[PDB]
Amino acid sequence: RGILQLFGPLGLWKLSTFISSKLNKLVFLNIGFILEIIVLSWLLIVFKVSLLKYILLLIIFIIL
Amino acid sequence: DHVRSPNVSFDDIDYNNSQDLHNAQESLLREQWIRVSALKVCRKALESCYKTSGPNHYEDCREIAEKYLNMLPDHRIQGFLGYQKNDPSK
Amino acid sequence: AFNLQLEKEIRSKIDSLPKLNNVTNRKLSLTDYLFQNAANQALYVDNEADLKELDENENEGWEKIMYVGFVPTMILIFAIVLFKDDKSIDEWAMDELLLRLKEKNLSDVELIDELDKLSKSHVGKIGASEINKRDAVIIERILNGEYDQLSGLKKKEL
Amino acid sequence: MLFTSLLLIIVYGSLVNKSHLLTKLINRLGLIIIIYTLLIHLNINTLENLSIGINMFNNLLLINSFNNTIIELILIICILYVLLISFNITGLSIIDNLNYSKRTFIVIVLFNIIGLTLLPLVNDIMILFIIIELQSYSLYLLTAIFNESHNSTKSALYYFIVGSIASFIILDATVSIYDDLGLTNIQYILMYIDKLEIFDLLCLLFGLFIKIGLAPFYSYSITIYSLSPTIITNYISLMPKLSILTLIYIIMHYINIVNNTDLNYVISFLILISMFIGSFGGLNVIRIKTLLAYSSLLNVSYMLLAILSNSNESIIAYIYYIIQYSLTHINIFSIILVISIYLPIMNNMLNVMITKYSPIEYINQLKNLFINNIFIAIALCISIFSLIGIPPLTGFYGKYLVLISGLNNGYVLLSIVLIIASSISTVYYATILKVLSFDTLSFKDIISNNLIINTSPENNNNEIKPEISNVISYVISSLTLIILLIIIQYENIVKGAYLVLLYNWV
Amino acid sequence: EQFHLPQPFWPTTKTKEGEYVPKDSIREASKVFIGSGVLLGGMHFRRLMQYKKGSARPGLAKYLNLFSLSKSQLIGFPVALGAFSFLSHSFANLQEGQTATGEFAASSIASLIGLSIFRTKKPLSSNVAIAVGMGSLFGFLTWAGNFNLGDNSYRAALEAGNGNEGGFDNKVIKTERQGFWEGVYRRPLSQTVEDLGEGRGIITQ
Amino acid sequence: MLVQNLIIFNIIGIVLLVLLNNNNNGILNKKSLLTIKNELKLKQIGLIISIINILIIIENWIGFNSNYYGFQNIERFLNIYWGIDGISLLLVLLTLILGPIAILSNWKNLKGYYTYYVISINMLVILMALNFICLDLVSFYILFESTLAPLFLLIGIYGANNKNKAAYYVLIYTLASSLFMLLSIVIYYIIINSTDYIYINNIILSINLQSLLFIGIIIGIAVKTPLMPVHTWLPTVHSESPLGGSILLAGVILKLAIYGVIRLLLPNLSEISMMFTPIIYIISILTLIYSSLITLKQTDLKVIIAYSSISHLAVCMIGIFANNLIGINGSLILCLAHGFVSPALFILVGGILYDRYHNRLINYYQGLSTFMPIFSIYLVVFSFCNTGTPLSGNFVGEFLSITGAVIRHPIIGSLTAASVLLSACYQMKLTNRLTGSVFSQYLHITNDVTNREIFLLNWLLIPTIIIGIYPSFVTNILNLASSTLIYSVLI
Ligand SMILES: CCCCCCCCCCCCCCCCCC(=O)OC[C@H](COP(=O)(O)OCCN)OC(=O)CCCCCCCCCCCCCCCCC
Ligand SMILES: CCCCCCCCCCCCCCCCCC(=O)OC[C@H](COP(=O)(O)OCCN)OC(=O)CCCCCCCCCCCCCCCCC
Ligand SMILES: CCCCCCCCCCCCCCCCCC(=O)OC[C@H](COP(=O)(O)OCCN)OC(=O)CCCCCCCCCCCCCCCCC
Ligand SMILES: CCCCCCCCCCCCCCCCCC(=O)OC[C@H](COP(=O)(O)OCCN)OC(=O)CCCCCCCCCCCCCCCCC
Ligand SMILES: CCCCCCCCCCCC(=O)OC[C@H](COP(=O)(O)OCC[N+](C)(C)C)OC(=O)CCCCCCCCCCC
Ligand SMILES: CCCCCCCCCCCC(=O)OC[C@H](COP(=O)(O)OCC[N+](C)(C)C)OC(=O)CCCCCCCCCCC
């Protein structure tokens, strides 16, 4: 009833609720929001590919 | 009737022959079960010698007991996968 | 055997008691559940609910199937494990061992005498038992040489 | 045939008077046009002849056996979609009259089908830009066909703005390539595949990724699919993906010639993020179309892994997956349109407002479907289990074939992540099934005369009145049994996908 | 004698001894740290302009609040990314190559350093729990071969003859170990003893 | 002949029950005639179908040769090769015998929808039975996971108060873990171009690749036995699932994991299985010891039995990973013996007590022997079978499994003997309480075991004791099939 729930249903439910609540705030009809994300993605073309894992770490920081 | 073991070794066949590899696998299995049959017969002799000899069993059954203790480690089923997948000489 | 005239008697009598919750000569057949008119099927249930309403753990409808289909099936399974002419590998190997003893010792007067008189039913009963049989020479010959051919299949050494 | 018959329908629709019956009969003429288009296309295009790849119209177009299969798939799915507007989906006028109130509905579909079928064939940068505009403009006009609807117009505004930004990105990529090489034909550009900047083609793919709703550009498609009418959302969420993904496969086929692993890593980054968003995004949602929008984002990520690997095993994976996913998409939306007839009627907390465009808008409006219609509820369960990937349904072989191509190319991470993504998304797929069936016994003996279906009259009380119309019922029956019983013909179907070649030859 | 444990690791090209010129860890971390701080700080002052241009429009304000970064995040993010780049290169130089253990250590420490800056108002054990989770993800990323196995994939092996295109033959026995993606019919018994060791049925009983 | 008839006949049975019971849905509002007596006729047809499935495997058993090496009855159907050996034959018969028992256990304790339940039971039985006769990895996975669709709906519709929790647990624990097993199957099909049993058994893969493939498969197997620490789904699923669902889950579904080791690990990944055996033994030993001590503190009757099943299946895992015939035969006999005793204990605990009092809390029951003497006899008899008392098939399975572990690993395999003590600690703590002291003050005196519940208990007890006294009925069939799994090169 302890660690196997934290690393199981109860723990993953809290993780899912936290992550899904973040994603629910990103779906709203707004021109400025989607334009910023489109233009931001252009940096993947500019950046050298070795920086992908740093962008991955930065994105996980923003989830918090 | 009484079927017989098709004596066929892994060393004399091409494994790409499906029926030939099947025979070598069966051939190795049947020779191990016979050794199990022989071991049980030897153990039958040991039990009868022990019962009859009474206090003389140490001397009377000495060579039967010695043979059973030698055959016991290897007169058991070992499978065919071990020798099929391994070449001892390499 | 729907017998619609019989239901009308059954339906009417339950009407003689307006109060609720305060026959053995009835049966149905297999062809009735699919061919009766929609009106008659309604009547049968209206009685069955009310007949049951006017009421231990028997006649539940499974006894015939399990005691005609299932128990004979287990009996047949019991028969197969008992009286099926199937050799196992261990039983085959003992027969093969006795056969090779005969072939290696054809010139043996004593051994072949015991092998011929050793019946097929006592092949697995070799040793000390209630059966009075002579296998002393048979056991003697197995203890002497090795009648397996495992060394002939491993042609590669270290 | 499409172009010629479209002109006649355009003029004919403006000549006759406006009535719901006439618009419905004009829609049936559109059904005949697509059927004749399919028959003519089948009569002349064959897989064996198109294996080499045949140029048409001064090499502006290039059709091969890989392009041809997608064109026939587009025509077949478009046939199934037109049955929705050409026949009764529910049989009740308050719901069905919407599909007959716009006479230009069928005209826009025929406009878009032309754009859908020509896009995979593009062989020049000038015609690539022209066709991608033709497909996009028709999608905007279809998203705004119901111009008296506030949400429908708002979606079309969002669709236009985002899709114009992507088109500019696509145009900017082709202009950069023309600036580098001074050439416009794709086969001419292939001669200089080693000298042009390959990331100029990644910019071209980025504009295509926006138009398929890939992450991080997923936000607008999730918003648009939920706000649009269910009949509109059924089309726009599937049709653009059939053509654009096929075009992405052909572009990635040319990109793999130079083997730029940096480009492979950026795309893998977009696939990885889309799996995370597609699975975790749908966990906390209450709208069914919002849930299906994330399902679409997730299944696109699965296909893009096959497109990214881009090998012989990828042709079989992509071709089979796109066919079976289209049928599952069609089957689910057909059931959702039908089952609005089982909605309870008032005679209140949360002040829930339901409109005529989307009568089924929340997942919990599917409650007690196991009681109202067991056969339809099972049909919906089979489709949802296929999306989950329960064998031996079609959805299992789709994931199995995608994994084979992905793992054969060394995409260990993406193969593991998608299988984790499949498990996470199973949570919200199961929630549909929980709503359909789990309260069956505690509700079986209840009196429900307050349904939408109960408002319909009865003819004679001596006849048998079917509760669902003939055509829509047969389509749901056919697609559900295909999804269920694909094991019977799976071996023969996958042998056909072996023959579909994209310059393999030998 | 060493324990004979299974080794579930995907194939990777192994640099020969004397190879692997190391990468300058400070220089590489400097580019990530400076470039990130310039962008994050620059995008911060760009968004303040968008604030001043409009603050009576709720639609713009809602979208700007999502992308807004706190002051401790504008400093913590470049520091965490810079420490990650430094520690990833520093450990890679130590081990003559990149390993999943090195990336697990580099990511968790970089996360914990950043978390202790922009997540000050949370318990210390909470920050460590996230750092262990973040470090495991990047260790798993390296274990799976980053985004693709590349030259170690089966498709690459099949093109180099190291696959199983020609099939198998038991008469052929190879002293050297088979390739990662290669399967054989029969193996030298010495290889089995090297893998499993003697004992419970190998050679002896 | 076997697979083709077993599938075609059951499809006709499924369609027949649907046609009869759904012909009157169309606003007839009638009273029908098959709906009487809780759909008695529709229940009886499904009960007959289950028994006929047992007759089909028998016709192919009469021709089975116990002295033939290899798969028999080799058949092609739906582009899939189907075959049977000694190991598969016994597991198929065990699976089909439990079919009628699952239906009869829920003969009159469902709130409704009897046709749906009977179809799902017959559908679960055939899919599990077909899983023992497939001959390739992909066909193994298709049948391994196909049972999730009906099982998920069976729990959620016919389950207890926490059925929603249990339905999600079984769907997500098993599907997520099996997808890792699918990854290993995809790798086999990529590098060898086939998933056939015989084809892949002859190929030796690199010791590093064998490790990755073993871990992928073992993840799917370890969750479904289940083993620690991925066992937490089972107690929740067993306490909420219907009685027939618990019988099939505790009788067949868990045995597919042992058969997974026999097919997917031992003959194809032989070299890496020897490397992993100490890890397997440590995990299984701690699974056995931990589950036994945890079972002591449980307060739910159906959860106590669920944890008892985990302890014995750890012993089955230990035996099957012994590299000798004694352990392999012992693990297989213990699988069959458990396949009868464990469903019987669920009938006593969750089928007789629950159908009378509708409460599974331990604190309500004591002194049952005063007014339920027949229940106490069967409860006591099956309790001693469950702890491996001699004369029961459980002991023969347990003793050979423990002996096989000792022969395989004398030091750590000796810890397996704690099954003898620990199993009796929690099982006889529960039985000593149900049959001890004064009849409970929280219970009203009611009927004892009925004829149907006597029938179920007798025909689960009878096979356990026949196997316990004369296991050679089973060992003769398994002898040649089990000997092929041993890997060793003695010089
Ligand atoms: C033997 C069984 C084995 C099976 C088990 C396998 C699962 C093991 C994983 C266990 C980890 C999850 C369980 C614990 C998570 C608990 C989440 C949580 O409590 O929220 C923490 C915090 C929000 O704070 P709050 O919850 O409100 O209060 C603090 C309570 N002390 O918010 C947080 O800090 C959460 C962290 C932010 C999210 C980080 C996201 C990282 C990337 C996602 C992780 C999964 C990646 C999957 C990738 C593929 C997805 C398609
Ligand atoms: C007179 C001055 C003129 C200044 C012009 C630049 C304007 C200010 C912008 C700040 C600088 C960032 C952009 C720098 C150029 C783009 C990156 C690049 O190309 O690499 C250059 C730099 C040095 O790398 P170098 O090895 O010298 O280049 C290859 C040589 N063979 O590589 C780097 O290390 C750059 C640092 C990048 C790492 C930080 C970015 C990642 C973290 C922030 C993420 C931003 C948001 C995420 C966007 C993606 C969203 C999906
Ligand atoms: C320079 C500007 C900032 C950079 C933005 C980058 C945008 C494109 C990157 C791809 C992510 C697309 C998702 C939509 C973009 C998110 C827009 C955004 O930045 O808003 C921040 C959002 C809101 O969070 P909140 O803290 O509540 O708001 C701030 C309050 N002041 O917080 C979020 O929820 C953002 C996280 C969204 C989920 C993305 C997760 C993608 C998967 C990452 C893990 C990958 C899984 C595999 C891991 C194993 C490998 C290590
Ligand atoms: C509560 C549930 C109700 C059920 C409870 C009681 C269960 C039934 C008890 C019996 C269990 C079934 C096992 C017996 C079935 C017959 C087994 C058999 O086939 O015996 C064959 C035996 C040797 O075989 P063979 O030499 O090859 O000759 C026959 C060729 N067909 O040939 C023979 O010599 C046959 C000898 C049979 C002897 C009678 C066996 C009955 C049991 C008595 C002995 C039990 C063992 C002693 C235990 C005492 C306590 C320690
Ligand atoms: C890989 C090694 C083998 C592991 C096999 C898979 C086990 C997954 C964990 C069980 C989850 C479960 O069962 O999901 C069911 C649970 C039910 O939660 P509940 O009890 O109703 O509490 C929740 C409600 N409360 C707290 C209010 C009472 O939904 C969840 O929590 C939703 C989160 C879903 C996450 C699923 C991701 C799966 C990833 C698998 C690989 C890491
Ligand atoms: C071996 C392969 C077989 C494949 C065919 C499956 C059965 C098809 C049933 C369609 C007809 C139907 O929906 O009918 C409904 C029937 C019977 O319900 P009822 O109690 O009469 O309904 C109530 C009517 N009253 C109110 C008049 C009494 O439910 C079934 O049959 C259920 C079986 C399917 C459950 C599991 C679904 C899993 C989906 C994914 C599978 C991999």
Burial of residue F458 (CB within 10 Å: 0-12, 13-18, 19+) is exposed
Quickly count: other Cβ atoms within 10 Å of residue F306's Cβ. Answer: 28
State the residue for tokens 């033939």: F68
Nearest to B87 among E169, E187, E201 (CB): E187
> Closest approach of chain F CAs to the CA of B54, in angstroms?
31
| Whole-number Å distance between alpha carbons of F120 and F103 | 10
> Closest approach of chain E CAs to the CA of B75, in angstroms?
12
Burial of residue F481 (CB within 10 Å: 0-12, 13-18, 19+) is buried
Ligand nearest to the CA of D418: 1
CB-CB contact of B31 with B5 (8 Å) = yes
State the residue for tokens 């008119």: C37
CB-CB contact of F377 with F135 (8 Å) = no
DSSP category for residue D61: E
Query: Which residue owns the Cα nearest ligand 1 atom 28?
Result: A14
**DSSP secondary structure of D247-299:** HHHHHHHHHTTT--HHHHHHHHHHHHHHHHHHHHHTSS--BHHHHHHHHHHHH
Quickly count: other Cβ atoms within 10 Å of residue F367's Cβ. Answer: 18
Residue closest to F254 by CA, chosen among F218, F288, F224: F224
Q: Return the percent helix, strand and coil in chain E, to nearest 5.
A: 60, 5, 40
Residue closest to B83 by CA, chosen among B24, B20, B1, B18: B24
Beta carbons of F485 and B79 less than 8 Å apart = yes
| Whole-number Å distance between alpha carbons of E185 and E183 | 7
> Closest approach of chain A CAs to the CA of E63, in angstroms?
6
What number of CA atoms fall less than 13 Å from residue F47's CA on the CB side? 23
CA D384, D390, D395, D400 dihedral sign is positive
Measured CA to CA in angstroms, residue F284 lies from F294, F331, F339, F426 at distances of 15, 13, 19, 18
| Whole-number Å distance between alpha carbons of E191 and E177 | 8
Beta carbons of C42 and F459 less than 8 Å apart = no
Chain B contact set for C143 (CB, 8 A): 41-42, 45, 64, 67
Quickly count: other Cβ atoms within 10 Å of residue D38's Cβ. Answer: 18
CB-CB contact of F173 with F154 (8 Å) = no
Q: Which of D283, D420, D447, D487 is best to mutate for the F interface (most F CBs within 10 A)?
A: D487
- Interface residues of F toward E, Cβ cutoff 8 Å, are 190-193, 202-212, 214-215, 271-272, 274-276, 279, 323, 408-409, 487-491
| Whole-number Å distance between alpha carbons of F300 and F303 | 5
F153 C-beta closer than 6 A to ligand 6: yes
Measured CA to CA in angstroms, residue F242 lies from A62, D250, F298 at distances of 45, 53, 20
Do D and B share at least 3 CB pairs under 8 Å? no
State the residue for tokens 């349109």: D337
CB-CB contact of D33 with D67 (8 Å) = no
Residues with CB under 6 A from ligand 5: A 8-10, 12-13, 16; D 420, 423-424, 427; F 165, 168-169, 172-173, 176-177, 219, 223, 230
| Whole-number Å distance between alpha carbons of F110 and F112 | 5
Q: Cα torsion at E57, E58, E60, E64 (round to 10°)?
A: 130
Nearest to D422 among F79, F152, F179 (CB): F179
End-to-end CA distance of chain B: 41
Could you give the 3-state DSSP secondary structure of residue F441?
coil
Q: Which residue of B has its CA nearest to E186?
A: B85
| Whole-number Å distance between alpha carbons of F156 and D430 | 11
Q: Which of A1, A3, A4 is best to mutate for the F interface (most F CBs within 10 A)?
A: A4
CA D134, D138, D139, D141 dihedral sign is positive
Chains that touch F (3 or more CB pairs under 8 A): A, B, C, D, E
Q: Which residue of C has its CA nearest to F450?
A: C57
Q: Which two tokens stand for residue D333?
A: 């939306």
Q: Which two tokens stand for residue F299?
A: 């307060």
| Whole-number Å distance between alpha carbons of F1 and F11 | 16
Chain B contact set for C149 (CB, 8 A): 5, 7, 31
Q: Which of F227, F232, F293, F299 is best to mutate for the A interface (most A CBs within 10 A)?
A: F232
State the residue for tokens 């049936």: D28
Is the bond leading into C18 cis (omega within 30 degrees of zero)? no
CB-CB contact of D319 with D402 (8 Å) = no
CB-CB contact of D364 with D434 (8 Å) = no
Q: Which residues, listed in sequence order, are joined to residue D226 by a DSSP beta bridge? A: none
Beta carbons of C150 and B42 less than 8 Å apart = no
Measured CA to CA in angstroms, residue F261 lies from D139, F55, F81 at distances of 54, 28, 20
DSSP category for residue F324: S
| Whole-number Å distance between alpha carbons of E180 and F204 | 11
| Whole-number Å distance between alpha carbons of D374 and F22 | 9
Q: Which two tokens stand for residue D18?
A: 């406006």
What number of CA atoms fall less than 13 Å from residue D32's CA on the CB side? 8
CB-CB contact of F89 with F7 (8 Å) = no
CA angle D122, D234, D315 (to 5 degrees): 45
**DSSP secondary structure of C92-122:** HHHHHHHHHHHHHTTT-HHHHHHHHHS-GGG
What is the Å distance from ligand 2's center to F268 Cα?
Answer: 50
Nearest to E188 among B10, B74, B90 (CB): B90
Strand F72-77 to F80-84 pairing:
antiparallel
Beta carbons of B25 and F69 less than 8 Å apart = yes
Chains that touch A (3 or more CB pairs under 8 A): D, E, F
Q: Cα torsion at F204, F209, F213, F214 (round to 10°)?
A: 80
Quickly count: other Cβ atoms within 10 Å of residue F237's Cβ. Answer: 27
Query: Which residue owns the Cα nearest ligand 4 atom 3?
Result: F462
What number of CA atoms fall less than 13 Å from residue D155's CA on the CB side? 28
CB-CB contact of F213 with F269 (8 Å) = yes
**Beta strands, E only, F69-194:** 72-77, 80-84
Q: Which two tokens stand for residue E78?
A: 């470049």
Beta carbons of D216 and A37 less than 8 Å apart = yes
Q: Which residues, listed in sequence order, are joined to residue D362 by a DSSP beta bridge? A: D287
Chain B contact set for F408 (CB, 8 A): none
| Whole-number Å distance between alpha carbons of F68 and F85 | 9
DSSP category for residue F261: I
Contacts by C129-137, CB closer than 8 A, 24 or more apart: C137/C110, C137/C111
* Radius of gyration of chain F measured on its C-alpha atoms: 22
Burial of residue C147 (CB within 10 Å: 0-12, 13-18, 19+) is buried
Nearest to C148 among B3, B31, B48 (CB): B31
Quickly count: other Cβ atoms within 10 Å of residue A24's Cβ. Answer: 14
Residue closest to F453 by CA, chosen among F371, F346, F364, F380: F346
| Whole-number Å distance between alpha carbons of E167 and D249 | 32
CB-CB contact of C124 with C96 (8 Å) = no
Measured CA to CA in angstroms, residue D140 lies from D116, D159, D333, F111 at distances of 14, 6, 21, 52
- Residue D309 contacts by C-beta under 8 Å, 6 or more apart in sequence? D405, D406, D408, D409, D411
| Whole-number Å distance between alpha carbons of F91 and F134 | 13
CB-CB contact of F275 with E6 (8 Å) = yes
| Whole-number Å distance between alpha carbons of D426 and D403 | 18
Residue closest to D105 by CA, chosen among D73, D144, D155: D144
Q: Which residues, listed in sequence order, are joined to residue E187 by a DSSP beta bridge? A: B86
Q: Which of A29, A58, A63 is best to mutate for the E interface (most E CBs within 10 A)?
A: A58
| Whole-number Å distance between alpha carbons of D79 and E106 | 56
- Residue D53 contacts by C-beta under 8 Å, 6 or more apart in sequence? D62, D63, D64, D503
Measured CA to CA in angstroms, residue F199 lies from B21, E157, F195 at distances of 11, 22, 7
Chain A contact set for F297 (CB, 8 A): none
Quickly count: other Cβ atoms within 10 Å of residue F449's Cβ. Answer: 22
Q: Which residue of B has its CA nearest to C152?
A: B9
F113 C-beta closer than 6 A to ligand 6: yes
Q: Which residues, listed in sequence order, are joined to residue F361 by a DSSP beta bridge? A: F300
C82 C-beta closer than 6 A to ligand 4: yes
Residue closest to D81 by CA, chosen among D31, D32, D45: D31
| Whole-number Å distance between alpha carbons of E28 and E75 | 19
State the residue for tokens 């499993």: E196
Quickly count: other Cβ atoms within 10 Å of residue D8's Cβ. Answer: 11
CA angle C136, C137, C138 (to 5 degrees): 90
